[PDB]
C-alpha cells in the first residue's frame, strides 16, 4: 500500500505548489477592464433538411463550407453563404456523433457508436463522394475527431484512450492513455503540437502528438466534461461539464483560472467554443439556449435562445464572421452580430 | 453566374434525394435492445432474424409490411450514461431481463430504474421482456432456491386476480412471475405521467411471437403519439 501513500503525498505536494502558484484571481486583475456589455446576435441564416438530431458540426478553413452530422445517417456539407446543400453523404452507421473537416478541404471524417472512423474524399476523380478509409481499432464508440493534416487524424473513443492515426496506412500511429473515463471531446492547438481532451472523469489532459505522453492534468470540475476548446493563442483552454459550470485552464499556470456559472443554470454544458479574439466564450446548454460570457469578467454577456431542443454542437468560423449552432431540432442556425 | 446555377441544381437534386430518404426514414421504426449477459438478447436476435470491434450491430426485420431496425450495443464499456443519449428518439426500448436469476434481478431492476428516470428517456416507452421463463419455472418447482431470500416482501405478496396463467401452470410459478412483473411495474409507475408506458410480457428466448408482440407495442406507441399530436388527447 506504499504506492497509494506515495501518490497521495505527491498529490498534496502538487496542490501545495499550485496554491504557491496562486497570487491573485483573474477577477481581481481584470476588475478594471471595460465590460463587453450586451451581445445581441441575430439569426442570419437557417439550414434545414436534416431528418433527425444533429450531434456534431465543424467549420472549414474557407469559413464558407460547414459539415454537419445527423443521427439519421447523413453527413451534409452546407454552403453557409448561399444556404444551398453542397454535399450529402449517406453514412453506413446512423448513430454518428462526431465529424471533422480537413484543413485542406479534400477529406471529411466522421464516426459514432460503431468503433470506426470513416474518412471520405471530397475531390474524387469521378466527382462522386466515396469513403477513402475506415480506421478501426478502438474498443469504444468514437466521440470526437480532428484533422492535423490530410494524412494524420486525432480521434477519441469511449475506451478511455485517444489515437493518432495515419490515414494512408490505416493504422493508429500513436495511442494516448491515462483517462479513467469515457473520452468526450478533444481540441487541437493552433500549432498542432499539443492537444487537450476531456474524458468524463472531472478532468482534462494535455497530450503531445509527437511524443505520445500526457503532460498535464486539470481536475477542477465536479462532473463529466462534455466539450473542450483551445484559446486562440493556444496557451489556455475551456471545458464545459454536466455540473452546469464552465472552467478556464491555463497550461503554464497548471490550475483553474476562471469559473463561469450561475445559480439559475442547473443543466450541463454540451458545447464550448472561443471567438477569434477569445474575449467571448460561447457555450451550448441543455436548457435549449446558448450563452456567451465574458472570458475575463465571467459575467453572462448574451443569450441566443432560438432552439427548441438541447444545443448539441457549437462552432465559430476561423475569421469569426458567424457562429454555427446545431441542436436536436434537426436545424443548424447561423448567428451574426448587427450594427 | 453559370456555376451558381449549377450549384442550385445540385442543391435541388440533393433536396430531392433527402426527401426520398425522409419518406423512407419515417417509414421505418427504430428500436433499442438492452440487456445483460444473463439475458438471452443475442438468442432473441438470432431468432427474430427469421423475420471484430464493431461496437453496434443492426438487425432489420419486417412485420405486417412494416420495417423495424433494432440496434444492439455490442462493444462498449460497462459505462453507458453517455451513448444511451443517442437513443432519445427510438420507437421503443426492448429490455431483456433474466427472471430465472435472482442474484442479479435487483441489478436489472436498478438498470430499469435508471432507464425510466433518465432525462433523455422520459418519452420512450420501454418494452419489458421477462426472458427465460422455463428456467424460472424449473427453479421455483425444484425448491432449491427461494425468492424470499432476495426479496423478503415476496412472502407477503399474493397473486392478483388480474393474472391469466397458462393452462397447467403451477400457482407458485405464476405467483413468482407476477411478483417480478409487479416489482418492475412499481418502478415503471413511480415516475412518468402518460409520456412513456411499460409493457410487461412473459416471453422465452425460443419464441416466434416476440416480433408480433413488438409490432403490437409499436402500434400502440405510435397510436398514443398520434392521439397527442392530433389534439385528441
Amino acid at each position, epitope marked *: 500500500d506504499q504506492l497509494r501513500q506515495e501518490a497521495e503525498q505527491l498529490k498534496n505536494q502538487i496542490r501545495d505548489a499550485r496554491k504557491a502558484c496562486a497570487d491573485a484571481t483573474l477577477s481581481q486583475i481584470t476588475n478594471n477592464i471595460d465590460p463587453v456589455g450586451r451581445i445581441q446576435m441575430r439569426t442570419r441564416r437557417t439550414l434545414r433538411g436534416h431528418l433527425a438530431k444533429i450531434y456534431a458540426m465543424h467549420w472549414g478553413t474557407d469559413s464558407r463550407l460547414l459539415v454537419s452530422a445527423s443521427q439519421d445517417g447523413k453527413l451534409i456539407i452546407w454552403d453557409s453563404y448561399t444556404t444551398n446543400k453542397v454535399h450529402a453523404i449517406p453514412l453506413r452507421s446512423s448513430w454518428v456523433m462526431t465529424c471533422a473537416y480537413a484543413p485542406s478541404g479534400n477529406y471529411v471524417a466522421c464516426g459514432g457508436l460503431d468503433n470506426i472512423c470513416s474518412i471520405y474524399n471530397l475531390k474524387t476523380r469521378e466527382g462522386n463522394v466515396r469513403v477513402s478509409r475506415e480506421l478501426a481499432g478502438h474498443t469504444g464508440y468514437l466521440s470526437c475527431c480532428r484533422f492535423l493534416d490530410d494524412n494524420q487524424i486525432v480521434t477519441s473513443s469511449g475506451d478511455t484512450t485517444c489515437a493518432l492515426w495515419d490515414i494512408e496506412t490505416g493504422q493508429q500511429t500513436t495511442t494516448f492513455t491515462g483517462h479513467t473515463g469515457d473520452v468526450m471531446s478533444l481540441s487541437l492547438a493552433p500549432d498542432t503540437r499539443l492537444f487537450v481532451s476531456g474524458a468524463c472523469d472531472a478532468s482534462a489532459k494535455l497530450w503531445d502528438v509527437r511524443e505520445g505522453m500526457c503532460r498535464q492534468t486539470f481536475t477542477g470540475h465536479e462532473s463529466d466534461i462534455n466539450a473542450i476548446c483551445f484559446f486562440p493563442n493556444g496557451n489556455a483552454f475551456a471545458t464545459g461539464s454536466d455540473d452546469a459550470t464552465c472552467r478556464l485552464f491555463d497550461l503554464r499556470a497548471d490550475q483553474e483560472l476562471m469559473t463561469y456559472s450561475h445559480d439559475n443554470i442547473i443543466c450541463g454544458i454540451t458545447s464550448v467554443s472561443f471567438s477569434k479574439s477569445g474575449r467571448l466564450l460561447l457555450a451550448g446548454y441543455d436548457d435549449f439556449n446558448c450563452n456567451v460570457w465574458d472570458a475575463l469578467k465571467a459575467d453572462r454577456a448574451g443569450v441566443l435562445a432560438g432552439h427548441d431542443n438541447r444545443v448539441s454542437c457549437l462552432g465559430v468560423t476561423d475569421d469569426g464572421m458567424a457562429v454555427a449552432t446545431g441542436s436536436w431540432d434537426s436545424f443548424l442556425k447561423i448567428w451574426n452580430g448587427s450594427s | 453566374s453559370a456555376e451558381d446555377k449549377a450549384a442550385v441544381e445540385r442543391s435541388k437534386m440533393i433536396e430531392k434525394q433527402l426527401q426520398k430518404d425522409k419518406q423512407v426514414y419515417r417509414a421505418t421504426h427504430r428500436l433499442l435492445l438492452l440487456g445483460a449477459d444473463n439475458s438471452g438478447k443475442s438468442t432473441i436476435v438470432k431468432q427474430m432474424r427469421i423475420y471484430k470491434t464493431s461496437g453496434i450491430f443492426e438487425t432489420k426485420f419486417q412485420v405486417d409490411k412494416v420495417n423495424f431496425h433494432m440496434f444492439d450495443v455490442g462493444a462498449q464499456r460497462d459505462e*453507458r450514461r453517455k451513448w444511451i443519449q443517442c437513443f432519445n428518439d427510438v420507437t421503443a426500448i426492448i429490455f431483456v431481463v433474466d427472471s430465472s436469476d435472482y442474484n442479479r434481478l*435487483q441489478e436489472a431492476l436498478n438498470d430499469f430504474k435508471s432507464i425510466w*428516470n433518465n432525462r433523455w428517456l422520459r418519452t420512450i416507452s420501454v418494452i419489458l421482456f421477462l426472458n427465460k421463463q422455463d428456467l424460472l419455472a424449473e427453479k421455483v418447482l425444484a425448491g432449491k432456491s427461494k425468492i424470499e431470500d432476495y426479496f423478503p416482501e415476496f412472502a407477503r405478496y399474493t397473486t392478483p386476480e388480474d393474472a391469466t396463467p397458462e393452462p397447467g401452470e403451477d400457482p407458485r410459478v405464476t405467483r413468482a412471475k407476477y411478483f417480478i412483473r409487479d416489482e418492475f411495474l412499481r418502478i415503471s409507475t413511480a415516475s412518468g405521467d402518460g409520456r412513456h408506458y411499460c409493457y410487461p410480457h412473459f416471453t422465452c428466448s425460443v419464441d416466434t411471437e416476440n416480433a408480433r408482440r413488438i409490432f403490437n407495442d409499436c402500434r400502440d406507441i405510435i397510436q398514443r403519439m398520434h392521439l397527442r399530436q392530433y389534439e385528441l388527447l
Partner: nanobody
Amino acid sequence: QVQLQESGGGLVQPGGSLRLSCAASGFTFSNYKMNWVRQAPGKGLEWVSDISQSGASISYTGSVKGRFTISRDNAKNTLYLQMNSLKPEDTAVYYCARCPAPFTRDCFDVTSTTYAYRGQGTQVTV
C-alpha cells in the same frame, strides 16, 4: 479534486453494529444523490442502498431493507451507513458512490468497473 473517502469497518462478529462514514470533497455534497454499493470477494459490484439529496427518498435492497439504514449530513458534507444485526455473508468491500450529474434522479453507472466518482472502499469482515 473529487474525493469520496470511506472510514470505519473492521472485524466484527455476527449480530453486531457498525457505522461507516463517507467524507466527500471537491464538489457540492448537497446537490448530488448518493449511493452505497458493495463488492464481495469473488462477486461483482452489488448495489446496497441509495439516498436522495434531501433525504426524503431512501431505498435499499431486499437483503438489507430491514437491517441497514442510511443518512446524510449536508452541513458536514458526509454520508453515514449504520449496519445492525450483521450476517456472515455481509463481508465485502463497501464503496460510497456519487451519481454522475447533479440535480438528477438517474444513477446509471454507480456500479460500473473503474467508476471515476466512487471511493476506494472500506473492508467489512463478519
